């Protein structure tokens, strides 16, 4: 969760050079992004997820 004490930083992406394309080819393209953890990764303290929100039972 969010706190000021353990803040981690910023991921940013910039144009080094532009996208040069030839004629009769579309200009606007799409980047996809992926994320995973490395082999030195860990988690420590169990809690309930803040995503589960029910009101009544599931009859």
């Amino acid at each position: 969760s969010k706190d000021i004490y353990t803040d981690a930083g910023f991921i940013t992406c910039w144009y080094q050079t532009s996208i040069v394309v030839p004629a009769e080819v579309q200009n606007q393209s799409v980047i996809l992004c992926f994320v995973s953890a490395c082999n030195d990764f860990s988690v420590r303290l169990l809690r309930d997820s803040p995503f589960v929100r029910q009101t009544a039972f599931y009859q």
């Binding site: 080094q16 050079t17 532009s18 996208i19 040069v20 394309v21 030839p22 004629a23 080819v25 200009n27």
Partner: protein
């Protein structure tokens, strides 16, 4: 194949996929200063991670009528992190470099750049008996531009491509450590540049060590539907930087 190259210096990494090779200077790889070639007597400063790393300069736009560009290079890194700070606090500096230039296109674009790395590029003036201001020889990370014809501005370099600002033949300018960026084979040009001077250490404000020059011989050309904006990006990494003579911050 040998077209894919990866370079790691610090916490910065460049992966290229259409490289050509790496030119290393005059065969010499950048190293530290030995005790036999030393002059000063006190302990130097070797940061080695906070200094030796890739810094990215400004991108320049390459139209069909572009003529060329230059950067002076102990001075284009004046405001680039702890390299520039370590320049500001010491009197004597000594480093080598790694100059990587990015330019991409498609298989329908044509053109050809020459990336030269020229030691001691003492440049001429537009008006002959006139003094050049320092804002025209260098501008930091902002590039200065050649002109196609005889330029005659005030307090300015003679900007003509066919004399390279030095009064020589621009075709003979390949005696220096150089590569080409041909847009049908290449994507980048890596030049490892060692320390070249007449003295073992020097001040990095009063002196200009070298000058990168990027000059398009084959002009940029494309069809009526291709992309127009083609940038050119220069990235530099100091190598084996050490520093001597610590005092207060300034240059005067």
């Amino acid at each position: 194949s040998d077209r894919v190259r990866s370079i790691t210096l610090g916490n910065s990494t460049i992966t290229t996929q259409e490289s050509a090779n790496v030119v290393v200077g005059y065969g010499v790889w950048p190293d530290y200063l030995s005790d036999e070639e030393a002059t000063a007597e006190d302990q130097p400063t070797q940061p080695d991670v906070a200094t030796c790393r890739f810094y990215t300069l400004d991108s320049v736009s390459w139209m069909k009528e572009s003529q060329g560009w230059w950067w002076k290079f102990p001075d284009a890194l004046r405001d680039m992190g702890l390299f520039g700070q370590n320049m500001q606090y010491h009197y004597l500096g000594r480093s080598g470099y790694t100059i990587h230039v990015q330019c991409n296109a498609s298989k329908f674009h044509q053109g050809c750049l020459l990336v030269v790395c020229v030691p001691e590029a003492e440049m001429g003036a537009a008006n002959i008996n006139e003094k050049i201001n320092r804002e025209h020889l260098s501008n930091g990370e902002v590039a200065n531009t050649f002109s196609g014809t005889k330029s005659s501005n005030t307090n300015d370099v003679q900007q003509a491509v066919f004399n390279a600002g030095m009064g020589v033949a621009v075709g003979n300018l390949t005696i220096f450590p150089h590569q080409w960026i041909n847009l049908r084979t290449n994507n980048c040009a890596t030049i490892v540049m060692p320390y070249i001077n007449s003295v073992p250490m020097d001040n990095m404000f009063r002196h200009y060590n070298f000058t990168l020059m990027i000059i398009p011989f084959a002009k940029l050309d494309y069809a009526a539907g291709s992309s127009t904006y083609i940038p050119i990006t220069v990235t530099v990494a100091p190598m084996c930087a050490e520093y001597n003579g610590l005092r207060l911050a300034g240059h005067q």
